[PDB]
Every structure is written in structure tokens, then in C-alpha cells.
Coordinates of C-alpha atoms and ligand atoms in Angstrom, one line a residue:
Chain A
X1 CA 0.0 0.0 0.0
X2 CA 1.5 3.3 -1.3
X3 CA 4.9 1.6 -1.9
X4 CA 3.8 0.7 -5.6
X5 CA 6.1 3.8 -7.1
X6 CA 8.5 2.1 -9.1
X7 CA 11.8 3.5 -10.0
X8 CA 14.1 3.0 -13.5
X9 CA 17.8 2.3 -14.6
X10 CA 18.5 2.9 -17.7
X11 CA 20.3 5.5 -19.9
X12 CA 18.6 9.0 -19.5
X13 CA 19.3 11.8 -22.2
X14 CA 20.1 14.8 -20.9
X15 CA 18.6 18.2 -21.5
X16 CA 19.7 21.7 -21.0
X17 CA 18.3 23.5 -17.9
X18 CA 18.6 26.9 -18.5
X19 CA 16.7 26.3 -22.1
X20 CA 14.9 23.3 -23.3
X21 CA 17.7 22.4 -26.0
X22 CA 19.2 19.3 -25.9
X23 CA 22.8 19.8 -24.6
X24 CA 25.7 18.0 -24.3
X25 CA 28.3 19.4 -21.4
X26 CA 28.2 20.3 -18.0
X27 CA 30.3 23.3 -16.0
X28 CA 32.9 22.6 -13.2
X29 CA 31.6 25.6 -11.5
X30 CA 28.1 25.6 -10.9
X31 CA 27.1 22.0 -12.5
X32 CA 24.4 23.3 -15.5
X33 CA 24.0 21.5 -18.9
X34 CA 24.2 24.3 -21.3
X35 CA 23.5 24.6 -24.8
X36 CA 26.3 26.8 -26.3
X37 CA 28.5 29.8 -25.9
X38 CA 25.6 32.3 -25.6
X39 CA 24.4 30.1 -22.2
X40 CA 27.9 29.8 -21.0
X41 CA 28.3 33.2 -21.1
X42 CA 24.9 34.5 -19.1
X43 CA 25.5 30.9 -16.6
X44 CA 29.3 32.7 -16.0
X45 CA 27.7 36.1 -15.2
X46 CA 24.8 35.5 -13.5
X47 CA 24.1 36.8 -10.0
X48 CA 24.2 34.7 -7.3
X49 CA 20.8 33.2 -5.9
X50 CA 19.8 31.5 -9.3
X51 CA 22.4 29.3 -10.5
X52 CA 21.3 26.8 -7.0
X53 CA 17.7 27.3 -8.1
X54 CA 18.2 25.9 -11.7
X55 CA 19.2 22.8 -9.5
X56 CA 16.1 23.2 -7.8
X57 CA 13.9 23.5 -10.7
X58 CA 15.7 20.3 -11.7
X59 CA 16.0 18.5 -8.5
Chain B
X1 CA 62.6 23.2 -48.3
X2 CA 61.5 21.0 -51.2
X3 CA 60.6 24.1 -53.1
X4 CA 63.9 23.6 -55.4
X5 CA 64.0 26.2 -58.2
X6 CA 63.2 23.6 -61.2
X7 CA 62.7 24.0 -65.5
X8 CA 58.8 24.9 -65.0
X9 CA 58.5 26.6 -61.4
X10 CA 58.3 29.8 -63.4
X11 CA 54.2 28.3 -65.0
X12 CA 51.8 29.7 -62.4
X13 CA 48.6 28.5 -65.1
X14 CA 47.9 28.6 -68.3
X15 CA 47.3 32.5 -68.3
X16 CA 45.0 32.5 -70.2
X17 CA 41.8 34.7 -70.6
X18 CA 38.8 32.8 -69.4
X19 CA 35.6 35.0 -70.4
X20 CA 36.7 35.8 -74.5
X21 CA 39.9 33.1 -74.1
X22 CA 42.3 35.5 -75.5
X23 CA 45.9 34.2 -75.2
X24 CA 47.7 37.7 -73.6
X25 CA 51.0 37.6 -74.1
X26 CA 52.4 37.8 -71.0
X27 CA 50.2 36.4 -67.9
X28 CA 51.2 33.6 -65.2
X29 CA 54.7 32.4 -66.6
X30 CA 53.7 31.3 -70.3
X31 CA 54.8 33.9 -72.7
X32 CA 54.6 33.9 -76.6
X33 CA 52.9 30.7 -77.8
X34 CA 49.0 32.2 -79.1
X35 CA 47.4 29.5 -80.5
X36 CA 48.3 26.6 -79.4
X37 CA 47.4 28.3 -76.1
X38 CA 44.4 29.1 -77.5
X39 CA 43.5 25.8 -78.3
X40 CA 44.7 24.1 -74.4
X41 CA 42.5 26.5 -73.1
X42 CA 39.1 25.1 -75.2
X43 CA 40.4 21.5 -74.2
X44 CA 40.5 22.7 -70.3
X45 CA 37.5 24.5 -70.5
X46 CA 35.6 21.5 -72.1
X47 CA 37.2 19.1 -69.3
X48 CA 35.9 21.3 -66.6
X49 CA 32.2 20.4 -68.6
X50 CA 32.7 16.7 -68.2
X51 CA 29.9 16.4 -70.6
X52 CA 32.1 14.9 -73.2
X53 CA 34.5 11.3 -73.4
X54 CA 37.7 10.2 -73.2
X55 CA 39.1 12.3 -76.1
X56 CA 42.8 12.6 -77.5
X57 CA 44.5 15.7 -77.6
X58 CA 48.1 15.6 -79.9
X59 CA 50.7 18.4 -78.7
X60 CA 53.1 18.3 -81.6
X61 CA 55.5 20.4 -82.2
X62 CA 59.6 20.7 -82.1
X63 CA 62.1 20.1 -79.7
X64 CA 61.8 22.9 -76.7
X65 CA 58.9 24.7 -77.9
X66 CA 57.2 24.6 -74.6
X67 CA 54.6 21.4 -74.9
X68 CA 55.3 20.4 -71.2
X69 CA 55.0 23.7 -70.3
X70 CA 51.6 23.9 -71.7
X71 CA 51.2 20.8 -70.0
X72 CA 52.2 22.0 -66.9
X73 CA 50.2 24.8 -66.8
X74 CA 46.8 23.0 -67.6
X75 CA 47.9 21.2 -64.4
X76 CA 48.6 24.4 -62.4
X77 CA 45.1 25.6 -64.0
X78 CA 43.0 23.1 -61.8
X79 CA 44.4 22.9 -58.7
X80 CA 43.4 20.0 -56.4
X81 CA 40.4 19.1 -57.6
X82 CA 40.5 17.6 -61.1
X83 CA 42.7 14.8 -61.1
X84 CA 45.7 15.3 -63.5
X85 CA 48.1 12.1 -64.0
X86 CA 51.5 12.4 -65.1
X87 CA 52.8 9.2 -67.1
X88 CA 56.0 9.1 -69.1
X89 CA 55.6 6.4 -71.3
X90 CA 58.2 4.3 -70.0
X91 CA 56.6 3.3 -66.8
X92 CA 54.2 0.9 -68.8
X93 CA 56.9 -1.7 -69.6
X94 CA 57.2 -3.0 -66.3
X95 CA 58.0 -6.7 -64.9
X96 CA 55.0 -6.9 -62.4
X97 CA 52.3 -7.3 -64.2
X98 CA 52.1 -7.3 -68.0
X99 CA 51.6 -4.1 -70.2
X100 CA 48.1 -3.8 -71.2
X101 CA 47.1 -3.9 -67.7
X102 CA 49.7 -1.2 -66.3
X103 CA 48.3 1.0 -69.3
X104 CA 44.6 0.1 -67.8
X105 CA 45.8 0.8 -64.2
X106 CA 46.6 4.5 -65.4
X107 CA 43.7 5.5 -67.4
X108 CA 41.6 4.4 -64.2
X109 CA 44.0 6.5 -61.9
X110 CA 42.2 9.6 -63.3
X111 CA 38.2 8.8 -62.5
X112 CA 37.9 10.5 -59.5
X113 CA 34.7 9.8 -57.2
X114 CA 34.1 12.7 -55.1
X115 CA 32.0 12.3 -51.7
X116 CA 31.6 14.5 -49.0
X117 CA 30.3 13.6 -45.6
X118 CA 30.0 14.8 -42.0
X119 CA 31.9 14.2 -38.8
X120 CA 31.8 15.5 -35.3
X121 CA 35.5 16.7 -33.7
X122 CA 36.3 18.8 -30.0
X123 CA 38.7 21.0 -30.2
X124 CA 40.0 22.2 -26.7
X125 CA 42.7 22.6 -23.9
X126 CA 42.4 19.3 -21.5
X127 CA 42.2 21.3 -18.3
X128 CA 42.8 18.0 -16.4
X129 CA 42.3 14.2 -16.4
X130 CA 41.8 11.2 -13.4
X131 CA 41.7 8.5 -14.5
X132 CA 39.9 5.6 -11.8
X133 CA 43.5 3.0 -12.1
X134 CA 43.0 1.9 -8.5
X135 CA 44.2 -3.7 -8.5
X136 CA 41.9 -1.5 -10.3
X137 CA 41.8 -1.0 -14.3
X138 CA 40.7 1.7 -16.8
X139 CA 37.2 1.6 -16.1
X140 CA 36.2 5.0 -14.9
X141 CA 37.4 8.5 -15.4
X142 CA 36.9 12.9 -15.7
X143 CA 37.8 14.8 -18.0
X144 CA 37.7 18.4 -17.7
X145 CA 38.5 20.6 -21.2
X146 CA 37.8 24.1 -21.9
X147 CA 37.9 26.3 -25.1
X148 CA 38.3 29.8 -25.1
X149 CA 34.7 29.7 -24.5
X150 CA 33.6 26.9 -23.3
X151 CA 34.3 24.3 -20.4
X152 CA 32.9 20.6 -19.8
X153 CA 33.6 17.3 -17.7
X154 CA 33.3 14.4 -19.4
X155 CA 33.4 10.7 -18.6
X156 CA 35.0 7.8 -20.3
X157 CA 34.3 4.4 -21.2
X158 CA 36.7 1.7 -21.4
X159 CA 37.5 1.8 -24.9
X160 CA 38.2 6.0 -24.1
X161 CA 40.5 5.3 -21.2
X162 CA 42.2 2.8 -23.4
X163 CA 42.8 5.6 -26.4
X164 CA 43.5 8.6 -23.4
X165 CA 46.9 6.5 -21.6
X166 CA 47.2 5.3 -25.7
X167 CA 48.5 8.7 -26.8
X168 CA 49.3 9.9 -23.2
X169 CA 46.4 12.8 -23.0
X170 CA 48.6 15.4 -20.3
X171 CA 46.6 18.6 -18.1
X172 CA 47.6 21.1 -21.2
X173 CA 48.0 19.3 -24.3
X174 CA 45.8 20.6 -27.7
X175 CA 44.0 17.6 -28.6
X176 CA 41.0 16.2 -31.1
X177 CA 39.0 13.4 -30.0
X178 CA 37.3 12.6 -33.2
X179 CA 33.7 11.3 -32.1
X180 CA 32.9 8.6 -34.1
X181 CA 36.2 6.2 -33.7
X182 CA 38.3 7.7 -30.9
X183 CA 41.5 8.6 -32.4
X184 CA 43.4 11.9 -30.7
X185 CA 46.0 13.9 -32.5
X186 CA 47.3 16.2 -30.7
X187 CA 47.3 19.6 -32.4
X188 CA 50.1 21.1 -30.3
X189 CA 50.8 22.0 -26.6
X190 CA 49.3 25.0 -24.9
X191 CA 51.7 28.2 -24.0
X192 CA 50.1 28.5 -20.7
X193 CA 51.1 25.2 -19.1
X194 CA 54.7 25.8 -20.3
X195 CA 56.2 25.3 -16.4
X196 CA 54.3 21.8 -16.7
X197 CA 56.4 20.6 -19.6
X198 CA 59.7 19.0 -18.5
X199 CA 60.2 16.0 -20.6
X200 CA 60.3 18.3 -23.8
X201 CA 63.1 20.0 -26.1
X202 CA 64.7 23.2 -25.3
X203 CA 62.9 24.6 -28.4
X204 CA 59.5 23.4 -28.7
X205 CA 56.4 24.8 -29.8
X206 CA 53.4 25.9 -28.2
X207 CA 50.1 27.0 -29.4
X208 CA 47.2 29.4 -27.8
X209 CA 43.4 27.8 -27.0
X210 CA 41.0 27.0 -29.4
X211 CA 38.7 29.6 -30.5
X212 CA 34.4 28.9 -30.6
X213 CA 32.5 25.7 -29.8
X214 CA 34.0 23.2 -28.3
X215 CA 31.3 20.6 -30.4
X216 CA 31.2 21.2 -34.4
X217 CA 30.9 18.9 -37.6
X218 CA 32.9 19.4 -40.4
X219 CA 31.9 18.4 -43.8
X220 CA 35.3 16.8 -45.1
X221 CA 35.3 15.8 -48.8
X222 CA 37.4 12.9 -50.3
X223 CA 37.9 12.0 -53.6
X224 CA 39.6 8.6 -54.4
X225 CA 40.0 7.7 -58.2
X226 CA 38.7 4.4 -59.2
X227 CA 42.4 2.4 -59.5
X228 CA 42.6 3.3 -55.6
X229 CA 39.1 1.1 -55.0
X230 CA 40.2 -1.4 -57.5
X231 CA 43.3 -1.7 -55.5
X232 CA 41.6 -2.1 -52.0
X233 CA 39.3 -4.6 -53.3
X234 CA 41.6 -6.9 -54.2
X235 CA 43.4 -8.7 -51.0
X236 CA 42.8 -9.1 -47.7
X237 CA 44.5 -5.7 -46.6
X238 CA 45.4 -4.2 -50.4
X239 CA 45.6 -0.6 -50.0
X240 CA 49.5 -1.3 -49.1
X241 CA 50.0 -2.5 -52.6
X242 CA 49.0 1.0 -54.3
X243 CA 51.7 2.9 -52.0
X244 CA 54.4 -0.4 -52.6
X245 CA 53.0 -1.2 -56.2
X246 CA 52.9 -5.0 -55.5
X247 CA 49.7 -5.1 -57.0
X248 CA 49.6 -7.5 -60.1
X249 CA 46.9 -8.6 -62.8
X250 CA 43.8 -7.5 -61.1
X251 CA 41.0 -10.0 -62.2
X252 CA 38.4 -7.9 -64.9
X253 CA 35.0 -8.7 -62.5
X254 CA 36.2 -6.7 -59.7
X255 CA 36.7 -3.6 -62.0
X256 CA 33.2 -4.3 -63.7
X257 CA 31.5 -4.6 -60.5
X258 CA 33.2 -1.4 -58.9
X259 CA 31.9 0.4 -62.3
X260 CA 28.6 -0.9 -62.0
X261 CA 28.4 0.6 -57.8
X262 CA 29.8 3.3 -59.3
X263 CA 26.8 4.1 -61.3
X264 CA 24.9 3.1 -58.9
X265 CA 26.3 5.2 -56.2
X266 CA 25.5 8.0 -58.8
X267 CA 22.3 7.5 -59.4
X268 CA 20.8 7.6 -55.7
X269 CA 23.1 11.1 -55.3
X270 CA 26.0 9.6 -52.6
X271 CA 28.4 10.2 -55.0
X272 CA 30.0 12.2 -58.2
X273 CA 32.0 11.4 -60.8
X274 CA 34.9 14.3 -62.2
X275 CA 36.9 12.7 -64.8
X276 CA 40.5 13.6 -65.0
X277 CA 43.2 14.1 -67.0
X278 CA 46.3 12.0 -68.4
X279 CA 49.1 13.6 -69.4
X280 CA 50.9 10.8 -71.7
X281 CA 54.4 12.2 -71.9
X282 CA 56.8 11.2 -74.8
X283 CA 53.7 9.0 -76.5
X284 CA 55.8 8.0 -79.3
X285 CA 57.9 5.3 -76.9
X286 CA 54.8 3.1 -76.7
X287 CA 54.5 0.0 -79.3
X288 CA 51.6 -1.1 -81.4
X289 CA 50.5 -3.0 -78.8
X290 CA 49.6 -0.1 -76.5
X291 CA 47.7 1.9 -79.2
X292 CA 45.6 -1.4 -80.6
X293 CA 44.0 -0.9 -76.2
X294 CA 44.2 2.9 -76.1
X295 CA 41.8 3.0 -79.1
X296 CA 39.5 0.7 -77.0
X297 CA 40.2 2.4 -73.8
X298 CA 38.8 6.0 -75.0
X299 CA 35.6 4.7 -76.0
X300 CA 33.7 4.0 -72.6
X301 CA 31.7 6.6 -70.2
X302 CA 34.6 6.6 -67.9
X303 CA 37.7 7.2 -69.6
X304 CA 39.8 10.4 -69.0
X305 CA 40.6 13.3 -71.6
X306 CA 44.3 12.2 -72.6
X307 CA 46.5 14.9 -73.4
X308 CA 49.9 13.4 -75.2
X309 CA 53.6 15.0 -76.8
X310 CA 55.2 13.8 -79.8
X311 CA 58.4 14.9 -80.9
X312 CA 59.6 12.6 -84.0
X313 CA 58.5 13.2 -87.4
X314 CA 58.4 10.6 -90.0
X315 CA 59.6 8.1 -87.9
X316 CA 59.3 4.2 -87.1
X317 CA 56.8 2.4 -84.9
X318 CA 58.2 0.4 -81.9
X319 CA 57.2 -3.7 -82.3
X320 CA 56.5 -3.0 -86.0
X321 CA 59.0 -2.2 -88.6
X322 CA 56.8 0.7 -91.1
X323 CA 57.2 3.9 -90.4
X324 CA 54.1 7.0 -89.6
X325 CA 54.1 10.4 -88.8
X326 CA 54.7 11.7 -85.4
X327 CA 55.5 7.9 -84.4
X328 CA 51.7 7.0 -84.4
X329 CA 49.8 4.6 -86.1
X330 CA 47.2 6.1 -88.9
X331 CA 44.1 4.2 -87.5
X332 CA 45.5 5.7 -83.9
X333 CA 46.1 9.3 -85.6
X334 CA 42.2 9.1 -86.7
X335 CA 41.6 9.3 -82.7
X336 CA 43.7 12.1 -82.0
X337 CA 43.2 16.4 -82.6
X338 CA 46.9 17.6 -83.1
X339 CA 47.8 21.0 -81.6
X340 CA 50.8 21.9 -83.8
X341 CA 53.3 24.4 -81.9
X342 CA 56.0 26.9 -83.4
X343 CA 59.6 28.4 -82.2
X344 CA 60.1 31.0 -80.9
X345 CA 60.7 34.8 -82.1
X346 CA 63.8 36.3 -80.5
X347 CA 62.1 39.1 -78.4
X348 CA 60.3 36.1 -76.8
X349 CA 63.3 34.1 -76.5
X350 CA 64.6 37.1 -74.4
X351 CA 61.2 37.9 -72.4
X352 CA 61.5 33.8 -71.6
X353 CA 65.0 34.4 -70.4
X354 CA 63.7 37.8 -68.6
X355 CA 61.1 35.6 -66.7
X356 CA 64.2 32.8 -66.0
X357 CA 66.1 34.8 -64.5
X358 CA 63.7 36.5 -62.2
X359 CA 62.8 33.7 -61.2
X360 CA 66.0 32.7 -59.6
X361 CA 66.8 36.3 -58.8
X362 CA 69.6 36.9 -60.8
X363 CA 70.4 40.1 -62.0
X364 CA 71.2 41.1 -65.2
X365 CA 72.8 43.8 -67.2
X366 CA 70.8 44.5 -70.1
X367 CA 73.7 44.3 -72.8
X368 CA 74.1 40.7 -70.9
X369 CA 71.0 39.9 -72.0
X370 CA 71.2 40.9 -75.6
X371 CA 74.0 38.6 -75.4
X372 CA 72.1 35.9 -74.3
X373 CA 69.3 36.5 -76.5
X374 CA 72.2 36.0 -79.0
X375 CA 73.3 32.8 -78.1
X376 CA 69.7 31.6 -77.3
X377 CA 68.4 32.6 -80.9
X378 CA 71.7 30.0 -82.2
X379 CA 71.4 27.3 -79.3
X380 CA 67.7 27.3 -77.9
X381 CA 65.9 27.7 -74.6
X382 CA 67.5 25.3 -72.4
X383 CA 71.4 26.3 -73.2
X384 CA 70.9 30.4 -72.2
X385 CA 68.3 28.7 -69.3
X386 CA 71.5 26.8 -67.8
X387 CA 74.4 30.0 -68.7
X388 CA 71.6 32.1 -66.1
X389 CA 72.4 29.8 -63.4
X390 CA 75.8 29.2 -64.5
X391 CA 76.5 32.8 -65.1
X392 CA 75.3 34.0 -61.4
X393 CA 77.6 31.7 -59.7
X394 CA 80.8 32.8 -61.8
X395 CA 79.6 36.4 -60.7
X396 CA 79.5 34.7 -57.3
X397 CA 83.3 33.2 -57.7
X398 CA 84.7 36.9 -58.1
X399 CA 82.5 39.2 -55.6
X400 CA 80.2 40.5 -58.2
X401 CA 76.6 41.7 -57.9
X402 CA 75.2 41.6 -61.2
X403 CA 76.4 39.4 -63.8
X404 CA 77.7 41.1 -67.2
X405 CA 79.7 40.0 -70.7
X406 CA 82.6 38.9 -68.9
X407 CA 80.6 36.5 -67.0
X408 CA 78.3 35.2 -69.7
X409 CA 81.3 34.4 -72.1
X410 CA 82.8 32.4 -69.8
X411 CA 79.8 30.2 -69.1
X412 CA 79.7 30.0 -73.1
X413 CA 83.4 29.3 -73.0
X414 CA 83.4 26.3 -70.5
X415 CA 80.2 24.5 -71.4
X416 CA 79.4 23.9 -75.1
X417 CA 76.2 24.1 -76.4
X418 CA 75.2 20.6 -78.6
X419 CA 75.8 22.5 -82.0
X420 CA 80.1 22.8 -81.1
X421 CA 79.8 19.1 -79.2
X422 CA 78.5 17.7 -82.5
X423 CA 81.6 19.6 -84.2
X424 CA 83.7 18.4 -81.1
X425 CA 82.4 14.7 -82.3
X426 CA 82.5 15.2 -85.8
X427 CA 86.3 16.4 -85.3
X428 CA 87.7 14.2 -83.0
X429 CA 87.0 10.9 -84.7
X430 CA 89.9 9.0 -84.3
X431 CA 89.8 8.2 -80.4
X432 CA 85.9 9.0 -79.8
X433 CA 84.5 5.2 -79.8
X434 CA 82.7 5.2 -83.4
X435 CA 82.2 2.0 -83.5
X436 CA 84.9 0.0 -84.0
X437 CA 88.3 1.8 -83.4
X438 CA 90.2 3.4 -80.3
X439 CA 93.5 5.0 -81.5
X440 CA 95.6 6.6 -78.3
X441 CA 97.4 9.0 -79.9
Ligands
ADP1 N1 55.5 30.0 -73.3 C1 56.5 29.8 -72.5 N2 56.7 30.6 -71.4 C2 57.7 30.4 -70.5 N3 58.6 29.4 -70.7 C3 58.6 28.6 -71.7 C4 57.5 28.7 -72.7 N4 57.7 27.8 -73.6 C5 58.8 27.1 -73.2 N5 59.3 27.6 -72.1 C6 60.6 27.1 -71.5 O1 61.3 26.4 -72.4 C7 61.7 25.1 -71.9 C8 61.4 24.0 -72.9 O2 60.0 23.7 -72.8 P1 59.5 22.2 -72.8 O3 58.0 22.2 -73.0 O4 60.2 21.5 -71.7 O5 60.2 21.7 -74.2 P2 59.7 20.3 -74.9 O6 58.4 20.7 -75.5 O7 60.8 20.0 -75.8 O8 59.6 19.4 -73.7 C9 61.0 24.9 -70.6 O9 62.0 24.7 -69.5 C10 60.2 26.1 -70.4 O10 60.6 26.7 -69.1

């Protein structure tokens, strides 16, 4: 009873989380999949307070 | 460095016109010949088409007219595109294979198949690597990389950790993980690790960081003639024979069936064809025997436009005992189109010379070069051509700068054109070896 959520394992593909464009590599720094140069660039400046809630959006 | 000042580095193209394809005089190295430049640029303009066959093109004409230099500049006007084969007809008559074959083996060196797909390359400084060796084994590992722009972890499988200690992947090194195999050539080393380098030369070089995406395709385009796939499909691992020419009678089904994918490949768009060109230097040193196959040869789709040089007039045919003009059979010279040349007119003889001798950077007094006009309009082209390089380092024996009269009549005094070595010959009989006699004196 209420333990019938079942998880998975298997391959996931990963998206971007600052868009919705599939993207490739993550960031030492602050751990986002990003899409290209243009998202590097506003992940690199953005203030600080937002780059721990994309995680949150996320999980 | 491999550059060496040769007898045609001077021919930057055919310099020709190409919107009326007017022969200017003067344009790109070739200087004086009109029609017969005329004509080589409506052949290379009509191979450019494609829309035509294996044709024959006859450059006739004297000794040192310029025929390989017309030659050599339709090869400089294509670039690397249109395959042009060089064959001096000597290296038919080998002892590999037979004849017939080796001439077979060059006319399908110049069908090029041209095919142009995608693959996906990093560029990129690796910022670091750890590598999970802990009794342990390459099974897991990071590795961090940056661009200029960019920056990215990775992970690795097995059979990336296996290619990363292959090549020995440092924190610094400028490398190109090609995608889709695994292979990683090393561009260079980056400057700004250059206190991390200590197993390096004293003088070594050192590049800066990629610039863009760190994540692009490139649309690479090969073409491979249609000898190379005849070649590779002919052993177990046969692409080694066309770089050590072990390759011997290839069996006539494989080239059938690689002309029928050929076609095939064409006709659902992965592929193009670009026929080529063969330059058959010195086509009079071929036997019967070669022209009774190259009158069969330039009959199908794919054969390549054959450009070819005679020098002999009335003149025997080898195997056979009859003699022909230009040392071609008649049922052969129905085939060909003959480009007759013409020497040369002695203010082009000495704009030639002008154009020789800037090339190699030798300077010249001008009563020098009426004097070598002079002896150029009495011993041809390639006598004045060698007194240039001669004549510069006599300057060079005496601490001159520019050469002059005195210089030029001593490279005419020590080195004897042919005319005064066939006078030499013709009086000095007695202990020259004739034929039969050796007197000593
Ligand atoms: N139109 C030209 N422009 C410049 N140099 C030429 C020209 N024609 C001939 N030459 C020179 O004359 C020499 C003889 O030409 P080449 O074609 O080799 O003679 P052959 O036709 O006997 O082989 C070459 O070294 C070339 O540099």
C-alpha cells in the first residue's frame, strides 16, 4: 500500500536547464547543462541566488 | 625546403583569358605561344564540362617549344580538384604485371569519385584528467576541457581510457578526440602550461586555446580515383600494394562490378564522378600494342581526356617495322586532334629568359641579355636557361653583384652548347669510340 512507485535504470538523455535544448556538457563551476556559448556566457555572469535554483527547478 | 628552383617553377597556369579566351602575351609564366594556347584552353575549359568522353588531344611540335609547359600549366590551371596524371611512357613496360594492364591501371587512376560527408570533432585545452586505475583498471574516469569559450567534464568508457593512456592525454595538451572512432591527434601543446612541460626539447612549440564551440561537424570531402578502390578490393589488406606497387593482374570482374556501384552510387546522389586528365608524356615510346587498347580504352563513359607529346617526325613504330608520322599509327592518328606548336621569335626568346632569370633572382645587365638573347636565338631555350644559373655563380666566384659580358662568355666558353659538341664529335673521330676503333694517340 502506497509503496507501488517504481523507480528506473536505464540511460537518461540529458537536456539543458537553463533552455529546453538538448545539450551535451556540463560546467565545473556551478554543474548546468548548457546549450552553447551564448548560455555559458549568461551561466558565467549570472548573480548569485539563481544558479542553485536551476538545480532546484531540476531536483 | 623542397621548393627547389626547377625547369617549370616559373608556370603559375595557363594565363589565359577565361571570359573571351584570348591568349595575352604575358600572364602567369607562359609567354609567346598564341594559338596553341588558345587551343589548351578550349580543351581545359571542355574538361571542366565533363559532358564529353575520353578524347585525345596531340601536342606536336619541335624540340623545346614549350609542350610540357603547356602541359604544366593546364595542371597548375585546376588545382586539387580535377585529377591530372602524369605518365612518361616508360613506366608501362614493367615486370609486375604485363603491359596492357599497367596502361589500364593509369587511365583508371584519373576517375575521381568525389563524396563529402560529415563528422563530429572537440577541439579544446584538456584542463585535467583522473583516470579511476585503482588492483583496479581503466574503467572510470573525468575529463575536464575548456575552449576559449567553453568548459565541460566528461566521462569515459573503457574503450576511451584505453585511447586517453594510448596517446598519453597530459593537463595542457591541444587535442582532437574525433567522435565517431576515438583517435586523438594532438594539435600542439598549450603556451600556458609551459612550467608543466619537463620532458620536452629546449625549443619546442606551443600554441594558444582554441577559438568557438568546443562541439562542431565538419563536412570533409574525399575524392579517391577508381584504381585506388580497385586496389583495396583486391586482398585481404590491399591498399598497401598501391603505396608499394605489389599489385599485379587485377581480375576484370572486380573492375566491372566497382563500375557498376559506381553508377549506382550515382544515381541515388551519394556520389560524383569528375573525370580527370592524363598527361601521356613522350607517346611515341609506346609499341603497337599499347595503341591497338588505347583506341578501346577512350571509347567507354569513364575514360579520362588524354593529353599526349610527340616529338619525332616521319619516324618508325616500336614492335612494328613501317614507319608514320609523329611515331603514331594512322588508325590511332584518326583518334587524335593535333595542336601543332612553333619556335620561338627572339624578343620572346629574351622575355623567356627575362622571366628565368627572375625567377631565380639573378640580375642582369641589359647588354648581358642581348648577349644571351644571342646565343639563345643560335642554341635554344635550355642552353641560355643553364648560362643564367651558371652565369650567377661565376659572378658569385669573383664578388660580383650583377652578372655582365665577362661572365656570360665564360659560361659560353666552358660549357658547349650541342651544336660545337657535335663539331667536337665530328672532329675528334679518331679516339671517340665510333664503333669500331680506339686510337691513343
Ligand atoms: N610559353 C613559355 N613561357 C615560358 N617558358 C617557356 C615557354 N615555352 C617554353 N618555355 C621554357 O622552355 C623550356 C622548354 O620547354 P619544354 O616544353 O620542356 O620543351 P619540350 O616541348 O621539348 O619538352 C622549358 O623549360 C620552359 O621553361
Amino acid at each position: 500500500t502506497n509503496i507501488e512507485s517504481a523507480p528506473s535504470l536505464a540511460p537518461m538523455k540529458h537536456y539543458c536547464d537553463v533552455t529546453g535544448l538538448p545539450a551535451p556538457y556540463l560546467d565545473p563551476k556551478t554543474r548546468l547543462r548548457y546549450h552553447n556559448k551564448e548560455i555559458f556566457a549568461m551561466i558565467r555572469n549570472l548573480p548569485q541566488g539563481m544558479g542553485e535554483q536551476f538545480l532546484e527547478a531540476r531536483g | 625546403g623542397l621548393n627547389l628552383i626547377a625547369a617549370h617553377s616559373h608556370i603559375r597556369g595557363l594565363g589565359v583569358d577565361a571570359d573571351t579566351l584570348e591568349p595575352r602575351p604575358s600572364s602567369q609564366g607562359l609567354v609567346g605561344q598564341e594559338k596553341a594556347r588558345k587551343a589548351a584552353a578550349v580543351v581545359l575549359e571542355m574538361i571542366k564540362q565533363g559532358k564529353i568522353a575520353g578524347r585525345a588531344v596531340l601536342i606536336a611540335g619541335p624540340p623545346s617549344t614549350g609542350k610540357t609547359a603547356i602541359a604544366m600549366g593546364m595542371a597548375q590551371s585546376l588545382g586539387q580538384d580535377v585529377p591530372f596524371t602524369t605518365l612518361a611512357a616508360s613506366e608501362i613496360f614493367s615486370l609486375e604485371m604485363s603491359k596492357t594492364e599497367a596502361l589500364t591501371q593509369a587511365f583508371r587512376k584519373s576517375i575521381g569519385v568525389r563524396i563529402k560527408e560529415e563528422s563530429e570533432i572537440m577541439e579544446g585545452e584538456v584542463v585535467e584528467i583522473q583516470i579511476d586505475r585503482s588492483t583496479g583498471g581503466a574503467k572510470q574516469g573525468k575529463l575536464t576541457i575548456k575552449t576559449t569559450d567553453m568548459e565541460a567534464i566528461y566521462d569515459m568508457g573503457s574503450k576511451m581510457i584505453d585511447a586517453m593512456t594510448k596517446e598519453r592525454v597530459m593537463a595542457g595538451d591541444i587535442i582532437s578526440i574525433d567522435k565517431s572512432s576515438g583517435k586523438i591527434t594532438k594539435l600542439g601543446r598549450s603556451y600556458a602550461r609551459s612550467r608543466d612541460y619537463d620532458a620536452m626539447g629546449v625549443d619546442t612549440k606551443f600554441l594558444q586555446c582554441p577559438e568557438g564551440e568546443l562541439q562542431k561537424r565538419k563536412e570533409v570531402v574525399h575524392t579517391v580515383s577508381l584504381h585506388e578502390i580497385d586496389v583495396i578490393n583486391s586482398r585481404t589488406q590491399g591498399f598497401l600494394a598501391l603505396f608499394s606497387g605489389d599489385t599485379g593482374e587485377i581480375r576484370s570482374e572486380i573492375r566491372d562490378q566497382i563500375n557498376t556501384k559506381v553508377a549506382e552510387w550515382k544515381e541515388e546522389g551519394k556520389a560524383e564522378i569528375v573525370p580527370g586528365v592524363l598527361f601521356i608524356d613522350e607517346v611515341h615510346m609506346l609499341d603497337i600494342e599499347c595503341f591497338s587498347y588505347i583506341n578501346r580504352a577512350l571509347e567507354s563513359d569513364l575514360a579520362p581526356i588524354v593529353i599526349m607529346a610527340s616529338n619525332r617526325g616521319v619516324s618508325r613504330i616500336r614492335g612494328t617495322d613501317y614507319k608514320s608520322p609523329h611515331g603514331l599509327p594512322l588508325d590511332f592518328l584518326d583518334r587524335v586532334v593535333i595542336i601543332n606548336t612553333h619556335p620561338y621569335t627572339p624578343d620572346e626568346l629574351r622575355q623567356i629568359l627575362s622571366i628565368r632569370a627572375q625567377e631565380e633572382e639573378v640580375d642582369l645587365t641589359p647588354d648581358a641579355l642581348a648577349l644571351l638573347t644571342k646565343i639563345g636565338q643560335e642554341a635554344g631555350l635550355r642552353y641560355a636557361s643553364n648560362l643564367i644559373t651558371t652565369s650567377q655563380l661565376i659572378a658569385a666566384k669573383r664578388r660580383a653583384k650583377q652578372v655582365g659580358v665577362e661572365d656570360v662568355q665564360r659560361s659560353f666558353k666552358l660549357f658547349y652548347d650541342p651544336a660545337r659538341s657535335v663539331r667536337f664529335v665530328q672532329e675528334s673521330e679518331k679516339r671517340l669510340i665510333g664503333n669500331d676503333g680506339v686510337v691513343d694517340f
